[PDB]
Design a protein around this ligand. Structure first.
Ligand SMILES: [Cl-]
Ligand SMILES: [Cl-]
Ligand SMILES: [Cl-]
Ligand SMILES: [Cl-]
Lengths: 131, 131, 131, 131, 131, 131, 131, 131, 131, 131
C-alpha cells in the first residue's frame, strides 16, 4: 500500500498529475459535470461525504493558491461559505456568478462529487506550486 | 437528478446491470482488486467511509440473497463480523478462507473500496431476484 | 438486483449522472439523433412503447424542472401535447420550433427512442435539483 | 427511415449479422448477462415489455430453427411454456437445467432484456436459414 | 437469419438508425469519402454492382423524402440521371454543383461505394418518416 | 485512384496483408461468422453478388495454393461444386464436413459474405507465394 | 499473396481508399507529419529508399492528376526537381512556398516517409479517376 | 500540486492502486517486460537513475512486506545484492532463479525501468498493508 | 537491446517521429501539461533528475535548431539561463512571457517532466534537420 | 530530428523497448504474420528492400545474442543463408524447421517485412544485453 498522500486511488491519480494552475472541483450532489471532465463520485448518501470534510482532505493533500466559488453560496449557504473562507484563510478566494463558475468547470481536470445536499456547495481548487 | 435509488453514480450504474447471482465486493482499504475488475473507490481518509456504513447502504439498495466473507474476519474483527451477521440476518452467510475469498472476487462485477482500516473487513454481496 | 429506481439499466445509468440542468430526450420513432448523442432505443414495434408511457416513467424517476417541446406538437398532435401539459403541470413548459428543438437535442445526454408513431411526439426533460 | 424489418435499431443490427446457428436471448428482468455479451435492455417498468410480446416480435423478424429454455420454466411458469410450444410449432424445443441454460447464453450474440417479472421466463433463439 | 429488410448487414445497421432527414450516399468508384464518414464498399469489379441496381435496392428499403445529385450528371451521364428521376418520381430531386454535392456528403451517415465506372453517378438519399 | 488490383477497398486491405498460408472465406448469405473474424459483406440482394462471381474475382487477384469446402456441397449444390473444381482445377481441393469447415473458419483473416442463396456455397482460399 | 498492385501492405491500404482528389505525401526524412495524419515510414537508412524510387512506384500504382511541391526544391534540389517534372510530365504541377505546402499536408491521407536526405524532397500526389 | 507522496506521477498512480500482496518491479536497463505489463521508464542515461536510488524512494513511499530477487544477483552483483538486504532488513527476502523471477514479473502491476547497467539488478516489491 | 541513441524508451519513441520544426518540452516539476500532450515523467524525487542534466542528454540525442524559454527564467533562475545559452551556442534562443510559453507547449509532441524544483526551469526544443 | 540510432521511426520504437531476450523478425514478402504481432512493412517493390540490407542495418542498431532461421533456407537460398552466417559470426545461429520457426514468430515483438522475393529469407534476432 501507498505510505503517504491522499487515501483515494482515483484522487491520488488526479493530484499526481497536477501542474501549477491546474484546477479540480469539489461539488455538491447537484452540480452538472461538463462533458469530457472526469467525474470521481464519493457520495454514499445524502450529506455524505460532506462538502466540508472533503474540502478539508483536499486542502491537506493539495497545494492550493486559489479557490473559486459561486457568489450564490453566500446567500443560501453561509455555513460552508464561512468554512471555505476559514479553511483557505491565506489563499485567494474569488466569487463568480454560479453561471460563470460552471463555465470555468469546463477547464477542470476532474469534478469530485460529494453527498452535500445544500445549495451552491461547490468550489474550484487551483493548484499552487511547491517551489 | 435521479429521484430514487443509491446516490452514487458509479454504484447506481453497477446495480443497474445486476442480474440474479451477480456479485459485488465491499472492501477495506487493503484488499487487492483483481485485474479486469472495476474499482469504485469511495475512501476519503482512514476509516471513512466505514465498512459498516457502506454495507448498510448497499443492503438498502440491492436485493441480496447471499453474503460471503473471509473466516479470518471472525478472529481479528468481531465488530464488523457481527454487524454483517445482524444486517443480513435473513440472507445466506458463508465464510471461506481469505485466500478462497480473494479467488472469488475475480468474478465480481466491481469492488467498492471503503476507508475501513480493520483486518478482513470485506464481503461479497450476491444479487437476489425481485420475483 | 437493484431494488429502487427506474428498471431500465441504460436509463438508470443516464439518470445516475444527471446534474442540475442536464437534459435528456424522449423521442418518437422518427426523430434524428445528433452525432455523439447516446441513443437508447426502447422500441418494440410501431406504437410500442408509447411516448406517453415512457414520459410517465421518466417523470416518476427524474426530477424535472423544465420541459421543452416543438410548437408543432400542439397543432399536429393534440393528444400527446395535452398529455405533456397535464403530466408536467407544475414544470415550466417551453415550446420552440421543431428545427430549434432538434438543434437543442445536440446538448442532450441521451435520446430515448420510443415506438411512438405520431407527429412531433418529442420532448426534452431538463433535470432539476433535490435541494 | 428503414422501411421493413424490426423497428428497434439495436435489435435490427443484431439480426443483420445473424448467420445459420447464431443465437440470441430474450430474458426476464433478472437473468444475469455474461461478460462480453451485448445487453439490449428494452425494459420500461416491471412487466413491460412482456416476455411473450417480445418473443413474438422476434419470431416475426427472425428465422428460428430451434428454441432452448430452462426446464424450470414449466414448473415455475406453465403459461409461458405453452406459448413457446405454440409459437414455435415447426421448431425443435429443447429444455435444459437453468444452470446449463445460463452457460449457453455465453455464446449468444446478445441478450434482450424484457421487463418480464416471472421466474425463468428466458429463452434462446437459434437462427435458421432462408435457403 | 433476418427475415425482412435489406440483405446487407452493414447497410441494415445504417438504415436501422435512420431518423427523419438523415442522409446516406450511393457513390461511384471514384467519389472521395469525407474523413469520419463510414464507407461501406460493395464493389466487386468495374461496373459491379451498378449504381442503378444499388439505388433500386435502397429505394425499396428506405423511405426517401429527397434526392440530391450533382448537375454534372446531366451532362456526361444522362442514362443514370434519367434512371434516378424515374426511380424517385414523387420525391424531390435537387441538383447542386458537384463541388457543393461533395460538401454535403460530409453530413452523411455513410457512403455506399458501388462499382459504377461512369461520371458523377452519385446521389444523396435524405430519409423521410413513416408517420 | 488505385490503378491495379481488386476494386473493393475492404478486400484490397485483406489481400495486402496476405502471407503464405493465410486463409480467406467466401460465404453464402447464411454462413455464420466466428467472433473476432472480420466480415466484409458484399451482398446486395438475394443472389447478388453470386458465389461464383465473387470467387472468380478473388481467384484472379489472390495467389491460391489450396481450396477447402464442405463435402455437403457436392450433393446439395452440384452447380457451385463443379464451378469450384473447374476454377481451381490446378489447386489442391480438400473437402471436410461442414462442421469441420466452420471450425476452420475461426482462423480466417476475414469472411466475405456474398448474396449467394444456395446451401453450402462457401469455401476457403489459402494463400500461396509469388516466389 | 496479393497478385497485383503495390507491394507494400500499408501503402496498398492507402491506395485502396483513394477517391478522386484525395491526397498522398511522399516525404524526405525530415518533413514533419501533421498530427492525425498516418505516417508510413519506409526509410531504411540515410538515402534509402530514395524519393525518386518511391515516387516511381506510387506513380505506377496510383492514377495521379496533379502534383504539388515546394518552390524551394527548384533551387535547393534541382536533381529531384527535374525528376518530378519528367516523371509527371503529363500531370499538372503546382509549386507553393514550403510553408503553404506543409499546411496543405494537413489534408493528406498519409505521409510516406522515404530515406531521402536532400532538402525539400517532398511532394503531394492528388488522385485522379479511372473513368 | 500534490503535497505528499512519491513525486513521479506515473509511479504515484501505481502506488495509489496497490492492495495487499500486489507487486511491482524495479528493473535494470535490460530486463524484458512481459506483454501487458505497464512499463514506466525513468532512465536518463546509462547508470541513471540507479537501481539503489530508485529502490530507496519506492521503499519510503510503499509498504513492502516481501521482496523477491534473482539468486544470480548475489554472485554477479554483490554491491546491489547487499544493498537490498540492508534496505529491506525487516522484510522477508526470497531469491528465485532469474528465469523464475521473470516468470513472476508477469503478475506485476508495472515494471519501473531504471538506468542501472549492472547484472541482475532487479527486484519485486510485494505490497504490505497499513492495518 | 538498442545499440545507439537515447536510453529512455519513451523519449526514443518521441525523437523517432521528430520532423523539422516539431517541438518537445523539458519541464520542472510544476509546469502544467496541456490536455492531449503526452507527458513522460522522469522525476524521481525533488531535484532529480535535474533540468540541466536532462537538457544535456536531449541536446546530445536531438538536432535542435531553436530553443524557447520564459523570460521569467532569467529573473527567477539566472543560472539555468546561462546553461542554455552555453549549451545551445549555435541555436536561436527566444524568450517569451511564461504565459505565451505555456500556450506554446500546446503544440509540443510531449512534455518531459524533470524533478527540477526551480522557478520557470522549462524550455522548448525545436527540432532541426540532418540535411 | 533524432541524431543517432536507426532511421526508421517504427523500428526505433521497437528497438527502444527491447529487453534482454526479446525477439523481432526480419521477413521476406511471403512470411505470414501471426495475429497480434505488429507488422512493419518496409517493402517498396519486388526485391526492395533486400533481406540482406535490412538484416545489416538491424545488426548495426541492435545487440543480437542469437539468430534463428529455418533449415529450408540452406536448401533453396544458400546465398542469404551464407550472408546471415557471416553477418552474425560470433552469435549463436540456430536452425529450426520452417514450421517450428513460424511457431516461434508468435512470440516476436514485431515482424519487419522486406521486399525479398527468395525462399525462406526470414530470421529471428533475439536481443542481448549491453552489460
Ligand atoms: Cl437507480
Ligand atoms: Cl432490417
Ligand atoms: Cl500520492
Ligand atoms: Cl533510437
Amino acid at each position: 500500500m501507498k505510505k503517504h498522500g491522499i487515501l483515494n486511488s482515483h484522487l491520488a491519480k488526479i493530484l499526481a498529475d497536477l501542474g501549477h494552475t491546474d484546477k479540480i472541483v469539489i461539488a455538491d450532489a447537484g452540480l452538472p459535470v461538463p462533458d469530457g471532465v472526469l467525474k470521481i463520485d464519493l457520495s454514499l448518501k445524502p450529506g455524505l461525504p460532506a462538502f466540508q470534510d472533503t474540502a478539508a482532505v483536499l486542502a491537506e493533500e493539495m497545494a492550493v493558491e486559489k479557490v473559486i466559488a459561486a457568489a450564490e453560496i453566500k446567500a443560501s449557504n453561509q455555513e460552508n461559505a464561512k468554512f471555505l473562507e476559514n479553511l483557505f484563510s491565506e489563499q485567494e478566494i474569488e466569487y463568480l456568478s454560479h453561471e460563470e463558475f460552471k463555465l470555468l468547470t469546463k477547464d477542470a481536470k476532474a469534478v469530485i462529487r460529494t453527498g452535500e445536499f445544500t445549495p451552491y456547495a461547490n468550489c474550484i481548487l487551483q493548484a499552487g506550486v511547491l517551489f
